[PDB]
């Protein structure tokens, strides 16, 4: 495997929100597009479901703090051996060494706003960006975000040493890679969403609780 | 596994309230939303029941100290071995080293207020945040809270070393992780609740004792 | 297991009142609510009976020194071994090291007051806090209290080392935990109660001796 | 295998965009032609599909930040051995040592522009560069780009040592090559695209989501 930013976001989600609903930003290219008020969409896969960013803030379709310093190091190792009566003896070791130090901050839209943003009419200037959104999938508004406030420098180091002897020959592979990445401030590390169901083109019906369809029209 | 904040809240609940009714805040992202007067809801699971924060203070639906310094270190270790006639010999060790030093303070709503907040009429401005709350689940008001007053820095260190030999091959995994987190002041570490049953839309019937239904309407 | 405050209260009750009737405060979050004049209620369990604090002082339902310095250290250890014909050999050791130094003071309501508080009429402003009290359980008034007068710092250290070999495999667990807590002044460490039976809504009948029902109405 | 620039672009895509849709620029000769607003075309192959740059910016057919410092080193090695009953024993080792340090920046066309660039009429001055584009293939607009901002110097080192004994004779080959390349600023390392479907010669229909045909005319 995963990006360094992926690992740091997974750690931040596992720590700053035990259970709950916060999901970790995957890619930092579109981290800026997961900021508060940015509309988000869902997509279904055979593995599961994921989120994408349309790049639309709420103002496009609207008619119109807390600082946590995480720091950790991780050392993991896993070795397996398999044997088969076909003279196939495989053995693989996978080790990892991670070091991260990050200082995140929390932002969130006040519940007063969500109280005001109830069943609002959209803009008559329907953008093709939104007008063409497939109604089969859902649509959400980003509510709360954990974003860095300092230039970070995260480090990882992976090692994959695995081989396998066959009845005829062998095959081995040894990889050792040290990786290091740098991050500017204000990169959203995690977010949570509130659904937006649209019975028609003037109903920004903000859905808080309940698995439902975001486009019943 | 658990968040560091989860562990420190579990320790604070086990110490500052032997037995009793106080429950420990799980995630520190929504710790600020478990402050006093913040409405809370229940949710049932196959494992049990848990609480969530609506983010509503009492003023939304209303018509209208003691300082404890805890410090501890924990060293635990557990090793198990299992054998099976199918040539399956597994063995796993799980160790943990925790160090915490925290200074919490207590706040609570005076019983005079709870005397005044009896069978109050709500606000005619029913927010969709509350209006859409599922009546199947319950609703509570946060009464007392233990909140930090100093920037804390908690440390943990886990180790999972477990392997298993099979009739054909083996499989091992060794993980060693040191973790450290920082916490700002005023983070609610634990809370207790008093129910609010609503026979109708103007009855904020505050329930002190008794397992009942919070929405008989 | 027990809270450190639980252990210190058990020691203070075992020392400052041999036999007698004083019961030890369990949780220090509601220690302040066990102060003198605070009404208390009973609750029955399959294990036995316990007390809770309503948070009501007598003034709510009324119409209208001695300093002991305890210091001790305790070192206990218990080791047991069990064998079974099913190839089950278990062995467990449980050790504890406690160190406490505390300076408590005694307060108590004079028997002149209890002489005056006989068969008093309550307040016509029946609070729902009291009005809804289940008449099946009892109701008491806190009479005497042992409360600290100095900021204390109590220490404990537990060790649980127990394992068990089975016919197939083994299972072991070793825990070592050092714990330390701090306490502000005026924390009630123990209390004793005098019952209040209510034949009607204007009879604060103060019961001194005799196991009876506190709500015959 | 691959060009050094190919390797650094693959690393930047794997890191700065986990999953997602960003594709890595392959050749740095035409990196400048993958800049924002530059039209791009697709081409299908038996292996898969790839992109080429027409060299056309949007202004040709229109009528009319974030800085990440990546640094890593990679050490990989793979050794295989094969035996055959025809007295053929081959063995090959392939090792690599990469060192890269790069500072990229992100640029992207604002969603306001994509809102404005909807179903635009093209220029009446149809260039033969575009007029002759085969309608079987697709056509896209480059939306976001990761481009270096500093003169970089990337290093690699490959080793291929493989031999094979046959029933009659042998055959061996050993190659060791250290390579180093330099890069000027503003070289686009990765890009993502938004399709442009043309039902006729005056319809710049900008397609966001959906695998379709970019020339239905």
GROMACS .gro file of N, CA and C in nm, chain C residues 89-146:
model
  174
  523UNK      N    1  -0.322  -3.032   3.412
  523UNK     CA    2  -0.245  -2.985   3.527
  523UNK      C    3  -0.238  -2.833   3.521
  524UNK      N    4  -0.311  -2.766   3.609
  524UNK     CA    5  -0.315  -2.620   3.613
  524UNK      C    6  -0.240  -2.572   3.736
  525UNK      N    7  -0.188  -2.450   3.728
  525UNK     CA    8  -0.118  -2.390   3.841
  525UNK      C    9  -0.126  -2.238   3.827
  526UNK      N   10  -0.169  -2.172   3.933
  526UNK     CA   11  -0.185  -2.028   3.930
  526UNK      C   12  -0.134  -1.957   4.054
  527UNK      N   13  -0.063  -1.846   4.034
  527UNK     CA   14  -0.011  -1.763   4.141
  527UNK      C   15  -0.067  -1.623   4.127
  528UNK      N   16  -0.108  -1.564   4.239
  528UNK     CA   17  -0.168  -1.432   4.242
  528UNK      C   18  -0.105  -1.355   4.357
  529UNK      N   19  -0.031  -1.249   4.325
  529UNK     CA   20   0.040  -1.172   4.426
  529UNK      C   21   0.001  -1.026   4.416
  530UNK      N   22   0.013  -0.957   4.529
  530UNK     CA   23  -0.022  -0.817   4.538
  530UNK      C   24   0.065  -0.741   4.636
  531UNK      N   25   0.097  -0.617   4.601
  531UNK     CA   26   0.180  -0.528   4.682
  531UNK      C   27   0.112  -0.392   4.684
  532UNK      N   28   0.062  -0.352   4.801
  532UNK     CA   29  -0.014  -0.229   4.816
  532UNK      C   30   0.060  -0.136   4.911
  533UNK      N   31   0.057  -0.006   4.881
  533UNK     CA   32   0.113   0.095   4.970
  533UNK      C   33   0.019   0.214   4.975
  534UNK      N   34  -0.028   0.247   5.095
  534UNK     CA   35  -0.122   0.356   5.112
  534UNK      C   36  -0.083   0.439   5.234
  535UNK      N   37  -0.100   0.570   5.222
  535UNK     CA   38  -0.085   0.664   5.332
  535UNK      C   39  -0.192   0.770   5.315
  536UNK      N   40  -0.282   0.781   5.412
  536UNK     CA   41  -0.399   0.867   5.398
  536UNK      C   42  -0.427   0.933   5.532
  537UNK      N   43  -0.488   1.051   5.527
  537UNK     CA   44  -0.524   1.127   5.647
  537UNK      C   45  -0.671   1.165   5.634
  538UNK      N   46  -0.757   1.096   5.707
  538UNK     CA   47  -0.900   1.115   5.696
  538UNK      C   48  -0.948   1.196   5.816
  539UNK      N   49  -1.068   1.251   5.803
  539UNK     CA   50  -1.134   1.323   5.910
  539UNK      C   51  -1.279   1.279   5.916
  540UNK      N   52  -1.339   1.293   6.034
  540UNK     CA   53  -1.475   1.247   6.057
  540UNK      C   54  -1.570   1.365   6.069
  541UNK      N   55  -1.687   1.353   6.007
  541UNK     CA   56  -1.796   1.447   6.026
  541UNK      C   57  -1.924   1.369   6.047
  542UNK      N   58  -2.018   1.430   6.119
  542UNK     CA   59  -2.140   1.360   6.153
  542UNK      C   60  -2.246   1.461   6.193
  543UNK      N   61  -2.371   1.429   6.162
  543UNK     CA   62  -2.483   1.514   6.200
  543UNK      C   63  -2.517   1.488   6.346
  544UNK      N   64  -2.528   1.595   6.423
  544UNK     CA   65  -2.551   1.582   6.567
  544UNK      C   66  -2.687   1.519   6.594
  545UNK      N   67  -2.693   1.441   6.702
  545UNK     CA   68  -2.818   1.376   6.740
  545UNK      C   69  -2.927   1.477   6.773
  546UNK      N   70  -2.891   1.602   6.802
  546UNK     CA   71  -2.992   1.706   6.816
  546UNK      C   72  -3.069   1.724   6.687
  547UNK      N   73  -2.999   1.724   6.573
  547UNK     CA   74  -3.067   1.738   6.445
  547UNK      C   75  -3.161   1.621   6.420
  548UNK      N   76  -3.112   1.498   6.438
  548UNK     CA   77  -3.198   1.381   6.421
  548UNK      C   78  -3.316   1.385   6.516
  549UNK      N   79  -3.298   1.446   6.634
  549UNK     CA   80  -3.412   1.470   6.722
  549UNK      C   81  -3.510   1.567   6.660
  550UNK      N   82  -3.460   1.672   6.594
  550UNK     CA   83  -3.547   1.768   6.528
  550UNK      C   84  -3.609   1.714   6.400
  551UNK      N   85  -3.538   1.631   6.325
  551UNK     CA   86  -3.586   1.578   6.198
  551UNK      C   87  -3.672   1.454   6.218
  552UNK      N   88  -3.774   1.463   6.303
  552UNK     CA   89  -3.862   1.350   6.330
  552UNK      C   90  -4.001   1.377   6.274
  553UNK      N   91  -4.047   1.287   6.187
  553UNK     CA   92  -4.180   1.293   6.129
  553UNK      C   93  -4.209   1.430   6.069
  554UNK      N   94  -4.111   1.483   5.996
  554UNK     CA   95  -4.127   1.611   5.930
  554UNK      C   96  -4.213   1.597   5.805
  555UNK      N   97  -4.282   1.706   5.771
  555UNK     CA   98  -4.349   1.714   5.642
  555UNK      C   99  -4.247   1.748   5.534
  556UNK      N  100  -4.262   1.688   5.417
  556UNK     CA  101  -4.171   1.712   5.307
  556UNK      C  102  -4.206   1.845   5.240
  557UNK      N  103  -4.142   1.873   5.127
  557UNK     CA  104  -4.176   1.989   5.047
  557UNK      C  105  -4.290   1.955   4.953
  558UNK      N  106  -4.384   2.048   4.937
  558UNK     CA  107  -4.491   2.030   4.840
  558UNK      C  108  -4.438   2.022   4.698
  559UNK      N  109  -4.318   2.073   4.674
  559UNK     CA  110  -4.254   2.067   4.543
  559UNK      C  111  -4.184   1.931   4.527
  560UNK      N  112  -4.267   1.827   4.513
  560UNK     CA  113  -4.217   1.692   4.493
  560UNK      C  114  -4.135   1.684   4.365
  561UNK      N  115  -4.003   1.666   4.374
  561UNK     CA  116  -3.924   1.652   4.252
  561UNK      C  117  -3.948   1.517   4.188
  562UNK      N  118  -3.949   1.515   4.054
  562UNK     CA  119  -3.959   1.388   3.984
  562UNK      C  120  -3.842   1.297   4.016
  563UNK      N  121  -3.729   1.355   4.058
  563UNK     CA  122  -3.616   1.275   4.103
  563UNK      C  123  -3.657   1.185   4.219
  564UNK      N  124  -3.733   1.240   4.315
  564UNK     CA  125  -3.782   1.161   4.427
  564UNK      C  126  -3.920   1.103   4.402
  565UNK      N  127  -4.008   1.178   4.335
  565UNK     CA  128  -4.145   1.132   4.315
  565UNK      C  129  -4.149   0.999   4.242
  566UNK      N  130  -4.053   0.973   4.154
  566UNK     CA  131  -4.050   0.852   4.074
  566UNK      C  132  -3.970   0.740   4.139
  567UNK      N  133  -3.921   0.759   4.262
  567UNK     CA  134  -3.844   0.655   4.328
  567UNK      C  135  -3.933   0.534   4.350
  568UNK      N  136  -3.883   0.417   4.312
  568UNK     CA  137  -3.959   0.294   4.328
  568UNK      C  138  -3.978   0.263   4.475
  569UNK      N  139  -4.104   0.248   4.517
  569UNK     CA  140  -4.135   0.223   4.657
  569UNK      C  141  -4.093   0.084   4.703
  570UNK      N  142  -4.062  -0.007   4.611
  570UNK     CA  143  -4.016  -0.140   4.650
  570UNK      C  144  -3.884  -0.133   4.726
  571UNK      N  145  -3.792  -0.049   4.680
  571UNK     CA  146  -3.664  -0.031   4.747
  571UNK      C  147  -3.678   0.069   4.862
  572UNK      N  148  -3.569   0.084   4.937
  572UNK     CA  149  -3.570   0.162   5.059
  572UNK      C  150  -3.513   0.302   5.033
  573UNK      N  151  -3.499   0.381   5.139
  573UNK     CA  152  -3.444   0.515   5.129
  573UNK      C  153  -3.381   0.551   5.262
  574UNK      N  154  -3.261   0.609   5.258
  574UNK     CA  155  -3.181   0.635   5.377
  574UNK      C  156  -3.122   0.774   5.371
  575UNK      N  157  -3.081   0.824   5.487
  575UNK     CA  158  -3.011   0.950   5.499
  575UNK      C  159  -2.870   0.922   5.550
  576UNK      N  160  -2.771   0.982   5.484
  576UNK     CA  161  -2.632   0.964   5.526
  576UNK      C  162  -2.607   1.045   5.652
  577UNK      N  163  -2.557   0.978   5.755
  577UNK     CA  164  -2.542   1.035   5.889
  577UNK      C  165  -2.399   1.077   5.920
  578UNK      N  166  -2.303   0.985   5.906
  578UNK     CA  167  -2.164   1.012   5.938
  578UNK      C  168  -2.077   0.976   5.819
  579UNK      N  169  -1.968   1.050   5.802
  579UNK     CA  170  -1.880   1.034   5.686
  579UNK      C  171  -1.735   1.052   5.726
  580UNK      N  172  -1.650   0.964   5.672
  580UNK     CA  173  -1.505   0.979   5.681
  580UNK      C  174  -1.455   1.030   5.546
   0.00000   0.00000   0.00000
